[PDB]
Design an enzyme around this catalytic site. Structure first.
Site, mmCIF file in Angstrom:
data_model
loop_
_atom_site.group_PDB
_atom_site.id
_atom_site.type_symbol
_atom_site.label_atom_id
_atom_site.label_comp_id
_atom_site.label_asym_id
_atom_site.label_seq_id
_atom_site.Cartn_x
_atom_site.Cartn_y
_atom_site.Cartn_z
ATOM 1 N N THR A 33 -18.813 -1.350 -9.566
ATOM 2 C CA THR A 33 -18.573 -2.358 -8.543
ATOM 3 C C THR A 33 -17.653 -3.445 -9.090
ATOM 4 O O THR A 33 -17.363 -3.496 -10.291
ATOM 5 C CB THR A 33 -19.884 -3.001 -8.023
ATOM 6 O OG1 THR A 33 -20.503 -3.779 -9.056
ATOM 7 C CG2 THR A 33 -20.857 -1.915 -7.489
ATOM 8 N N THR A 94 -21.113 -4.094 -13.443
ATOM 9 C CA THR A 94 -21.128 -5.350 -12.704
ATOM 10 C C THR A 94 -20.133 -6.305 -13.366
ATOM 11 O O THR A 94 -20.162 -6.500 -14.576
ATOM 12 C CB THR A 94 -22.546 -5.947 -12.683
ATOM 13 O OG1 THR A 94 -23.430 -5.025 -12.037
ATOM 14 C CG2 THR A 94 -22.581 -7.282 -11.953
ATOM 15 N N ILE A 130 -21.243 -4.376 -18.434
ATOM 16 C CA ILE A 130 -20.718 -5.646 -17.941
ATOM 17 C C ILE A 130 -19.211 -5.526 -17.983
ATOM 18 O O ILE A 130 -18.628 -5.265 -19.027
ATOM 19 C CB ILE A 130 -21.180 -6.860 -18.776
ATOM 20 C CG1 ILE A 130 -22.706 -6.973 -18.776
ATOM 21 C CG2 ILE A 130 -20.545 -8.148 -18.251
ATOM 22 C CD1 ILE A 130 -23.332 -7.210 -17.415
ATOM 23 N N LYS A 131 -18.594 -5.722 -16.832
ATOM 24 C CA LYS A 131 -17.162 -5.589 -16.692
ATOM 25 C C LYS A 131 -16.507 -6.954 -16.929
ATOM 26 O O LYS A 131 -16.880 -7.946 -16.293
ATOM 27 C CB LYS A 131 -16.836 -5.034 -15.293
ATOM 28 C CG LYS A 131 -15.681 -4.052 -15.254
ATOM 29 C CD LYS A 131 -15.820 -3.031 -14.137
ATOM 30 C CE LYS A 131 -15.455 -3.605 -12.787
ATOM 31 N NZ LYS A 131 -15.154 -2.502 -11.834
ATOM 32 N N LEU A 132 -15.562 -6.989 -17.869
ATOM 33 C CA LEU A 132 -14.714 -8.162 -18.164
ATOM 34 C C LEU A 132 -13.254 -7.719 -18.194
ATOM 35 O O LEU A 132 -12.966 -6.625 -18.689
ATOM 36 C CB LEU A 132 -14.962 -8.719 -19.567
ATOM 37 C CG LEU A 132 -16.335 -9.042 -20.107
ATOM 38 C CD1 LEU A 132 -16.977 -7.791 -20.688
ATOM 39 C CD2 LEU A 132 -16.199 -10.120 -21.167
#
Ligand SMILES: [Cl-]
Ligand SMILES: [Cl-]
Ligand SMILES: [Cl-]
Ligand SMILES: [Cl-]
EC number: 2.2.1.2
Lengths: 316, 316
Positions: A33, A94, A130-132
């Protein structure tokens, strides 16, 4: 046999959407997402319960409005992640607020905060990415998070400098974009027609894949952002590929077996010295496409974040 | 009266060229050069003596080829600077190798090396500006150099973030570009016609000028890179303007007095906290024009440097 089934022999299929209907339909291993997909999935009437739960929970954690907005938007993204994890066996990605993209400290804090909310729901770190954004700051944030047992999805990966730096930081996974690379070349050259193999997004991922395997790096390569199924098929063999429902449908409806395209059969090679910040900056900014698209992708995700917070603020 | 004469009432006129003929003709206060202007001025047969002197001197300082190339290219730029200082009363701007633009340490070292060569010729630091690209690293380099008595010209200044950062670092001078800002807008919008007052480069410098004066910053504001005299006239009042001979000619040949356009008559205002690196990075990358043009300008100057070194290497 259909092409989606055939692709699954070579590549881990991942669904790029916040919509649980797609999870049921395509049964992907992981899901991804982002703020805009969360914003989109919010308008789905069946998700109104998840928004209300997020707003209610936020009001139970604190009494300050500003904090309630942040808590509620975070809890919403998490709540959607939790519904998706009911239907996929692997990871949920996310995305952190992209306004933090050039702030290592703030990004680490935000990653930990999203992990806390997942952990509070009973979900382990091994189910979460965790998307960065893969700025130097994001890569440095990711390096630290991995050491603390938080696995990261390094996104908006455009330049070889970003690819190299991510690998050397030991990040769990990278999301090199394909479709947005094609977008650039169409906007900045007069070649608007590309055979799949010469699609510049496809070339980028193939080169990154080669470099990663040839040096025995463990970072998962996951192609993302596609304009057509031709791009996807040309990357068959990529560790994972995250694909929108429209294109998952096209693959499922396409008959015929496909061949593996991306392989490395040689032996692992010695690694160079680590790229320094100064070297990374020089090499990233040598790539005009990557210069444009990394900054642009960050700007757009921050706007999506703001719009999500606006929507949440109206309900408080 | 002519417009060049009239402009000199409001603004310090600076010649943007390596050609001594222009210094004699227009009698500017300062001059600016860069790798491409040096490369161009090299083909002038009357400068061959300066190339030969540079190459000869380099061979006397050392015996290593690689070092002779660097020594000779540096000495050439310095030699041209010296010929110009014979004909201008103020500053000469000499540009550091732009391949160092994201390297603070290397840029400081290079600045100091060029200053040493000028000092060895008997020229004081008060006659010289070292030109560096205004990346964060260049700004940090400049901050340190100023403290050591080396004055800097912070170039390729596109975003407000760059302007603010340069002022807060106490740099001697900034070169906000005008023409290249116009270039971007023409290329990336369908408005290719702009009245002088709405030229986005003119708007940029005017906003920067206002911010600087209103907060009492001493950094000299010097507009650079012009596409037409309309831009120049619209910035009458700017501390300095560096102008190419072609446009100096147009102004000199244009009859009529001009009015001052850029003024600040208010009182000095309190300054904010310093912008942090993370804030600077966020704010610079909010400006798609600046993102593109800063990186692009650096790429092109580095190519010009490489071509200069090629030419010098052939003569060794
Ligand atoms: Cl981030
Ligand atoms: Cl946080
Ligand atoms: Cl950005
Ligand atoms: Cl960026």
């Amino acid at each position: 046999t259909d092409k989606l089934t055939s692709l699954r022999q070579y590549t881990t299929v991942v669904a790029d959407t916040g919509d649980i209907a797609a999870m049921k339909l395509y049964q992907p291993q992981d899901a991804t997402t982002n703020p805009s997909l969360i914003l989109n999935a919010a308008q789905i009437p069946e998700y109104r319960k998840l928004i209300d739960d997020a707003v209610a929970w936020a009001k139970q954690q604190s009494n300050d409005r500003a904090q309630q907005i942040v808590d509620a938007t975070d809890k919403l993204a998490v709540n959607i992640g939790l519904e998706i994890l009911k239907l996929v066996p692997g990871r949920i990605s996310t995305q952190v607020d992209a306004r933090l993209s050039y702030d290592t400290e703030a990004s680490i804090a935000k990653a930990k905060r999203l992990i806390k909310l997942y952990n509070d729901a009973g979900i382990s770190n091994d189910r979460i990415l965790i998307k960065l954004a893969s700025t130097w700051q994001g890569i440095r944030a990711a390096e630290q998070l991995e050491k603390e047992g938080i696995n990261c999805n390094l996104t908006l990966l455009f330049s070889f400098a970003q690819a190299r730096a991510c690998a050397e930081a030991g990040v769990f996974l990278i999301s090199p974009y394909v479709g947005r690379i094609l977008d650039w070349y169409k906007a900045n050259t007069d070649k608007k027609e590309y055979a799949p193999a010469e699609d510049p997004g496809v070339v980028s991922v193939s080169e990154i894949y080669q470099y990663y395997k040839e040096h025995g790096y463990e970072t998962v390569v996951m192609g993302a952002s596609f304009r057509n199924i031709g791009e996807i098929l040309e990357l068959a063999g990529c560790d994972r590929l995250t694909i929108a429902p429209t294109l998952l449908k096209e693959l499922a409806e396409s008959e015929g077996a496909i061949e593996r395209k991306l392989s490395y059969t040689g032996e692992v090679k010695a690694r160079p010295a680590r790229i320094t910040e100064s070297e990374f900056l020089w090499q990233h900014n040598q790539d005009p496409m990557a210069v444009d698209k990394l900054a642009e992708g960050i700007r757009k995700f921050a706007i999506d974040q703001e719009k999500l917070e606006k929507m949440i603020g109206d309900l408080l």
